Write an enzyme that holds these catalytic residues in place. Sequence first.
Site, PDB file in Angstrom:
ATOM      1  N   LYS A 172      -2.956  -3.482   8.016  1.00  0.00           N
ATOM      2  CA  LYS A 172      -4.009  -3.274   7.031  1.00  0.00           C
ATOM      3  C   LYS A 172      -4.573  -4.586   6.506  1.00  0.00           C
ATOM      4  CE  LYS A 172      -2.373   1.274   5.580  1.00  0.00           C
ATOM      5  NZ  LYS A 172      -2.265   2.246   4.467  1.00  0.00           N
ATOM      6  N   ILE A 209      13.671  -4.568  -3.423  1.00  0.00           N
ATOM      7  CA  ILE A 209      14.023  -3.368  -4.170  1.00  0.00           C
ATOM      8  C   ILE A 209      14.747  -2.372  -3.270  1.00  0.00           C
ATOM      9  CG2 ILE A 209      13.097  -1.543  -5.668  1.00  0.00           C
ATOM     10  CD1 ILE A 209      12.635  -4.277  -6.837  1.00  0.00           C
ATOM     11  N   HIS A 260      26.852   3.323  -5.082  1.00  0.00           N
ATOM     12  CA  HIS A 260      26.720   2.011  -4.466  1.00  0.00           C
ATOM     13  C   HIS A 260      27.734   1.845  -3.342  1.00  0.00           C
ATOM     14  CE1 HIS A 260      24.855   0.171  -8.388  1.00  0.00           C
ATOM     15  NE2 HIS A 260      23.950   0.788  -7.649  1.00  0.00           N
ATOM     16  N   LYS A 301       3.743   4.131  -1.420  1.00  0.00           N
ATOM     17  CA  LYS A 301       3.809   4.888  -2.666  1.00  0.00           C
ATOM     18  C   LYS A 301       4.388   4.051  -3.803  1.00  0.00           C
ATOM     19  CE  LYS A 301       5.497   9.294  -4.587  1.00  0.00           C
ATOM     20  NZ  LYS A 301       6.259  10.549  -4.303  1.00  0.00           N
ATOM     21  N   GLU A 314      31.026  -3.555 -12.267  1.00  0.00           N
ATOM     22  CA  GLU A 314      31.525  -2.240 -11.889  1.00  0.00           C
ATOM     23  C   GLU A 314      32.646  -2.433 -10.874  1.00  0.00           C
ATOM     24  OE1 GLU A 314      27.660  -0.830 -10.586  1.00  0.00           O
ATOM     25  OE2 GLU A 314      28.235  -1.013  -8.476  1.00  0.00           O
ATOM     26  N   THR A 345       0.799  -1.219   0.000  1.00  0.00           N
ATOM     27  CA  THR A 345       0.000   0.000   0.000  1.00  0.00           C
ATOM     28  C   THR A 345       0.837   1.278   0.000  1.00  0.00           C
ATOM     29  OG1 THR A 345      -0.203  -0.221   2.407  1.00  0.00           O
ATOM     30  CG2 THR A 345      -2.036  -1.041   1.077  1.00  0.00           C
TER      31      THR A 345
HETATM   32  C1  LIG Z   1      11.541   0.823  -0.330  1.00  0.00           C
HETATM   33  C2  LIG Z   1      11.121   2.219  -0.812  1.00  0.00           C
HETATM   34  C3  LIG Z   1      10.791   2.182  -2.308  1.00  0.00           C
HETATM   35  C4  LIG Z   1       9.873   2.644  -0.040  1.00  0.00           C
HETATM   36  O1  LIG Z   1       9.545   4.005  -0.352  1.00  0.00           O
HETATM   37  P1  LIG Z   1       7.999   4.469  -0.501  1.00  0.00           P
HETATM   38  O2  LIG Z   1       7.252   3.495  -1.323  1.00  0.00           O
HETATM   39  O3  LIG Z   1       8.106   5.919  -0.935  1.00  0.00           O
HETATM   40  O4  LIG Z   1       7.548   4.420   1.025  1.00  0.00           O
HETATM   41  P2  LIG Z   1       6.134   4.405   1.747  1.00  0.00           P
HETATM   42  O5  LIG Z   1       6.347   4.846   3.138  1.00  0.00           O
HETATM   43  O6  LIG Z   1       5.206   5.206   0.843  1.00  0.00           O
HETATM   44  O7  LIG Z   1       5.565   2.935   1.746  1.00  0.00           O
HETATM   45  C5  LIG Z   1       6.209   1.799   2.347  1.00  0.00           C
HETATM   46  C6  LIG Z   1       5.148   0.946   3.005  1.00  0.00           C
HETATM   47  O8  LIG Z   1       5.756  -0.193   3.648  1.00  0.00           O
HETATM   48  C7  LIG Z   1       4.950  -0.496   4.766  1.00  0.00           C
HETATM   49  N1  LIG Z   1       5.670  -1.418   5.630  1.00  0.00           N
HETATM   50  C8  LIG Z   1       6.474  -1.138   6.703  1.00  0.00           C
HETATM   51  N2  LIG Z   1       7.003  -2.200   7.258  1.00  0.00           N
HETATM   52  C9  LIG Z   1       6.515  -3.250   6.502  1.00  0.00           C
HETATM   53  C10 LIG Z   1       6.711  -4.642   6.560  1.00  0.00           C
HETATM   54  N3  LIG Z   1       7.546  -5.200   7.445  1.00  0.00           N
HETATM   55  N4  LIG Z   1       6.066  -5.414   5.661  1.00  0.00           N
HETATM   56  C11 LIG Z   1       5.285  -4.820   4.754  1.00  0.00           C
HETATM   57  N5  LIG Z   1       5.032  -3.519   4.591  1.00  0.00           N
HETATM   58  C12 LIG Z   1       5.681  -2.783   5.497  1.00  0.00           C
HETATM   59  C13 LIG Z   1       4.610   0.857   5.370  1.00  0.00           C
HETATM   60  O9  LIG Z   1       3.464   0.713   6.199  1.00  0.00           O
HETATM   61  C14 LIG Z   1       4.322   1.650   4.095  1.00  0.00           C
HETATM   62  O10 LIG Z   1       2.946   1.452   3.713  1.00  0.00           O
HETATM   63  P3  LIG Z   1       1.689   2.333   4.165  1.00  0.00           P
HETATM   64  O11 LIG Z   1       2.030   3.793   3.841  1.00  0.00           O
HETATM   65  O12 LIG Z   1       0.488   1.824   3.446  1.00  0.00           O
HETATM   66  O13 LIG Z   1       1.584   2.195   5.677  1.00  0.00           O
HETATM   67  C15 LIG Z   1      12.262   3.234  -0.558  1.00  0.00           C
HETATM   68  O14 LIG Z   1      12.577   3.308   0.820  1.00  0.00           O
HETATM   69  C16 LIG Z   1      13.502   2.914  -1.383  1.00  0.00           C
HETATM   70  O15 LIG Z   1      14.333   2.107  -0.975  1.00  0.00           O
HETATM   71  N6  LIG Z   1      13.608   3.558  -2.548  1.00  0.00           N
HETATM   72  C17 LIG Z   1      14.736   3.370  -3.448  1.00  0.00           C
HETATM   73  C18 LIG Z   1      14.604   2.100  -4.271  1.00  0.00           C
HETATM   74  C19 LIG Z   1      15.721   1.953  -5.274  1.00  0.00           C
HETATM   75  O16 LIG Z   1      16.041   2.883  -6.010  1.00  0.00           O
HETATM   76  N7  LIG Z   1      16.326   0.767  -5.304  1.00  0.00           N
HETATM   77  C20 LIG Z   1      17.334   0.414  -6.293  1.00  0.00           C
HETATM   78  C21 LIG Z   1      16.718  -0.043  -7.606  1.00  0.00           C
HETATM   79  S1  LIG Z   1      18.052  -0.559  -8.719  1.00  0.00           S
HETATM   80 MG   LIG Z   2      20.814   3.332  -7.434  1.00  0.00          MG
END
Ligand SMILES: CC(C)(COP(=O)(O)OP(=O)(O)OC[C@H]1O[C@@H](n2cnc3c(N)ncnc32)[C@H](O)[C@@H]1OP(=O)(O)O)[C@@H](O)C(=O)NCCC(=O)NCCS
Ligand SMILES: [Mg+2]
Lengths: 393, 307
Positions: free
Chosen positions: B49, B102, B258, B25, B216, B23
């Site tokens: 939820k 991710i 990284h 973003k 890399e 749920t």
């Molecule tokens: C993981 C990531 C995407 C989350 O960011 P986000 O989606 O903006 O974060 P949000 O707070 O909106 O949502 C995360 C959800 O996880 C939920 N959550 C927390 N702990 C949890 C668990 N143990 N199990 C499941 N869900 C969980 C939260 O409740 C939240 O949901 P909610 O708002 O409905 O309550 C971010 O921290 C991240 O790592 N981004 C970079 C990713 C990236 O670039 N990776 C490399 C790709 S090569």
């Molecule tokens: Mg990156």
Amino acid sequence: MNLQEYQSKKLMSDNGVRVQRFFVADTANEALEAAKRLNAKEIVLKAQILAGGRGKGVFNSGLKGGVHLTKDPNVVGQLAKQMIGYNLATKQTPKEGVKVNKVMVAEALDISRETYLAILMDRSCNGPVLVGSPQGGVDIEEVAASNPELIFKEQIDIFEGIKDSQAQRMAENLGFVGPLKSQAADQITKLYNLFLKIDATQVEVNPFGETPEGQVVCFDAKINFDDNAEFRQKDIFAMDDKSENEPIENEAAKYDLKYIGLDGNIACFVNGAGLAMATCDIIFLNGGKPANFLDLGGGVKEAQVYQAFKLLTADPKVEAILVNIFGGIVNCAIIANGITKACRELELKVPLVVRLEGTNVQEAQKILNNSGLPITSAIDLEDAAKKAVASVA
Amino acid sequence: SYTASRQHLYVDKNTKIICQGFTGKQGTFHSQQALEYGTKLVGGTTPGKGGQTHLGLPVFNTVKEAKEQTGATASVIYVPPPFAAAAINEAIEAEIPLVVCITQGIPQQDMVRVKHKLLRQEKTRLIGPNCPGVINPGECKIGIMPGHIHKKGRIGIVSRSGTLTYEAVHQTTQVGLGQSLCVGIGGDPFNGTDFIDCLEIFLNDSATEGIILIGEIGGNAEENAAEFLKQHNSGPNSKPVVSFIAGLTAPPGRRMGHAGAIIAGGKGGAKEKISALQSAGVVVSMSPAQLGTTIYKEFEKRKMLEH
Ligand SMILES: CC(C)(COP(=O)(O)OP(=O)(O)OC[C@H]1O[C@@H](n2cnc3c(N)ncnc32)[C@H](O)[C@@H]1OP(=O)(O)O)[C@@H](O)C(=O)NCCC(=O)NCCS
Ligand SMILES: [Mg+2]
């Protein structure tokens, strides 16, 4: 992040690790009083800057040397007056130097044997490793190329913790004998528990030494911290001393951005560490020089894009800008909106080459197509590098 | 041992998926994309939820709950860094055959504990963290990669860089070769899947006729893969391997985004990895834009193109 010597040694001392007794002084008179409070046969005065080579540095006040030894608290204050408030330059600082606001006043100690001891997260071994050598006081890489038989290691199970057997065995391989071995093993154990407590990626002690009086002391040390643990290491990261970092890098960090300044004149605005490295590489391959590495990551917000783009248009060396985005989690339209907002406040006067692909690419191209900006469009990464290099050469 | 779970990397049209952090973003947006792509996303977890409905699919409090009720065989994690190691462990404990994380920013010490558990079982295969995911084009998409650049085909891709994975996919789509299976192993120093893991699948997969390996600076995983290729891919029926190693021009002693990407103590340089891969018969494209054309030409020499 970086800690001053007095900060890292305080952290070690507060966690049971034996270091040289010391005070920190903001004034020469405080340094002179600190020298008296120690009541030690000999005293060491050390300028507090992050760079290396303090031994051979020179102050803009004339004092040659950042580390000094004397048996007289009066000489400590006399020397301090030429350090505090005065810029200390060394082989590893800018020619200007670093303003010394603090000096350390510590008990000097005779070293009767120097060893090397570190704890690090070892990728090959999938967790913490003790690394030690009886060859102390030199680059450990020089010991590994000359005498790899003198590099000893122990793999520590993350859940079991360091065993007494492992600490004892490492103490023995470092040359510690008899009572000094139990001292060394207990310090090894305390260093390992510190390493875990503070989310270090490495804690390096060199020299890990003995004194003629039979003390095991950590004389000098360097700690590297896992940036990913900042959320649970607020107190330590609050102490971060950014005073010697490149200024644009400091600015980028304020917005969760990773910027590394290079020597070229072609700015890079890229998402992803790999694509960002590869963009620097392909500019070099095609006859140009990149001005910076920049890793726009994950869920970028428009304000971050805007601020990051301005970091490029403010570097005086930049003569062209290469925007290269291959969006997965990065939304190309947010990039487009942030760039256009930045350009609306600038005259630009530099070529702007733009390659966009991936998530929401179509909307982003419409934003850029409607912006009225002088953009050079690029079809692929090679085309973008060749167009960027041509625009300035 | 944990290597027995390598097969779980090869997702397909029958793989059903749950999303941890469903749920949030990013879990929402990329779940939407997976749905539109046709992937069999059947639900997700968000502690607190359970019982709700999201994107027309059930939300659960726990992975075990979601696995039992939906029959999912894979999970993808969009959980924030302070909690994502626990999320990975939950999926391991639930014996989810494939878990993709991710999340960027998980503490290294957390991932040390996660690997400790992971290596002591073989029901669960982890990809990541700090990775784009895995995709079997046209059959199953698990991650953040833009769907529209893929075309089912003949090249297996493994990469430490997310965005360079997209480049390699795009270029092999352009030259007509397509992709059999694409795995981004991520840029973190402690992860669940290395190069050799993917090369085993690729060399044994008849659909995979060539391989792109993207690496890399930092570590020794590329050097290890070279040796593996020396012994397992040197015969006359060898599969062409093309590679690009990022960071040839990177400054030393700097983390290049990284955590893994750092030239330290004189170790981890790119040219050392390039020479090692070349010694194993891998063709290294010097330009990252020419992976597609470079492997096309290697297919031409071997008379491997339909024409
Ligand atoms: C993981 C990531 C995407 C989350 O960011 P986000 O989606 O903006 O974060 P949000 O707070 O909106 O949502 C995360 C959800 O996880 C939920 N959550 C927390 N702990 C949890 C668990 N143990 N199990 C499941 N869900 C969980 C939260 O409740 C939240 O949901 P909610 O708002 O409905 O309550 C971010 O921290 C991240 O790592 N981004 C970079 C990713 C990236 O670039 N990776 C490399 C790709 S090569
Ligand atoms: Mg990156």
